[PDB]
Amino acid sequence: IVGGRKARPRQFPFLASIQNQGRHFCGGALIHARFVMTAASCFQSPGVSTVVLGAYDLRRRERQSRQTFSISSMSENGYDPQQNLNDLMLLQLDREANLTSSVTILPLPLQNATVEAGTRCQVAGWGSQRSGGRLSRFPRFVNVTVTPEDQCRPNNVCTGVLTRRGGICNGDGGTPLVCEGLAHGVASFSLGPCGRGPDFFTRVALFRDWIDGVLNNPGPGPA
Numbered sequence: 223i224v225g226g227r228k229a230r231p232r233q234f235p236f237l238a239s240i241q242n243q244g245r246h247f248c249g250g251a252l253i254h255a256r257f258v259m260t261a262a263s264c265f266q267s268p269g270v271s272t273v274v275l276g277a278y279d280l281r282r283r284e285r286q287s288r289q290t291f292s293i294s295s296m297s298e299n300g301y302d303p304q305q306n307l308n309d310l311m312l313l314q315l316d317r318e319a320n321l322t323s324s325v326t327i328l329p330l331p332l333q334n335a336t337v338e339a340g341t342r343c344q345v346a347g348w349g350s351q352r353s354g355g356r357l358s359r360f361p362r363f364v365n366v367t368v369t370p371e372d373q374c375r376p377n378n379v380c381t382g383v384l385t386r387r388g389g390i391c392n393g394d395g396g397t398p399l400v401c402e403g404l405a406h407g408v409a410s411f412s413l414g415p416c417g418r419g420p421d422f423f424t425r426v427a428l429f430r431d432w433i434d435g436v437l438n439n440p441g442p443g444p445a
């Protein structure tokens with residue numbers, strides 16, 4: 223996260239940390255006790271990662287706070303790598319997370335809901351503060367603004383900071399964009415230097431139904 227402030231413990235309790243060999247590579251959100259919503263793009267270079275909930279300081283063990291999980295199944299709906307279309311993915315946890323003061327669910331918008339340009343949102347994560355720089359051990363967050371459609375693409379929700387540098391950076395992939403208390407976006411990509419803008423998030427409301435379907439039909443799938 224660029225241009226942000228350090229978060230307090232349990233300030234974004236729905237946040238997730240996707241790690242590989244203990245190395246954080248993407249963020250995500252708990253949207254249901256058994257699933258975490260993230261970015262399909264996070265999965266290119268698979269499920270031999272872990273999902274960490276309730277973390278704060280990436281360097282500590284915070285045993286009394288964290289819950290760790292394996293990924294039983296991955297669900298994508300038309301992800302297109304080439305264009306980065308439909309960059310959204312659902313991970314099913316090996317087991318049901320427990321809901322504590324440090325681990326909660328972030329609600330979803332209704333199918334097709336919209337957010338207008340100029341709307342104020344928040345984004346948090348452990349990503350770096352500079353292109354190719356080092357991750358942040360504490361989560362950080364920044365106030366962002368929804369841009370005009372013309373600045374974005376239909377599949378996404380785009381944002382910017384009134385200020386200078388602000389936005390997502392390395393490690394912020396799949397982290398959620400939260401507007402009016404709901405997960406309106408999933409961090410996808412951004413062009414050029416972190417902080418420049420605008421930032422591209424998958425438009426969550428377009429997938430509500432498909433998501434519900436997944437939630438309602440759990441289980442690895444065809445074999």
Ligand SMILES: *[C@@H]1O[C@H](CO)[C@@H](O)[C@H](O)[C@H]1NC(C)=O
Pocket residue numbers: 333334
């Ligand atoms: C959402 O919008 C699409 C395209 O505008 C439409 O075809 C579909 O009927 C809509 N779904 C509902 C739940 O409004």
Ligand SMILES: *[C@@H]1O[C@H](CO)[C@@H](O)[C@H](O)[C@H]1NC(C)=O
Pocket residue numbers: 226227363364365
């Ligand atoms: C976010 O916005 C609120 C409301 O304007 C503000 O008072 C607060 O300082 C901001 N925090 C940062 C991290 O932008």
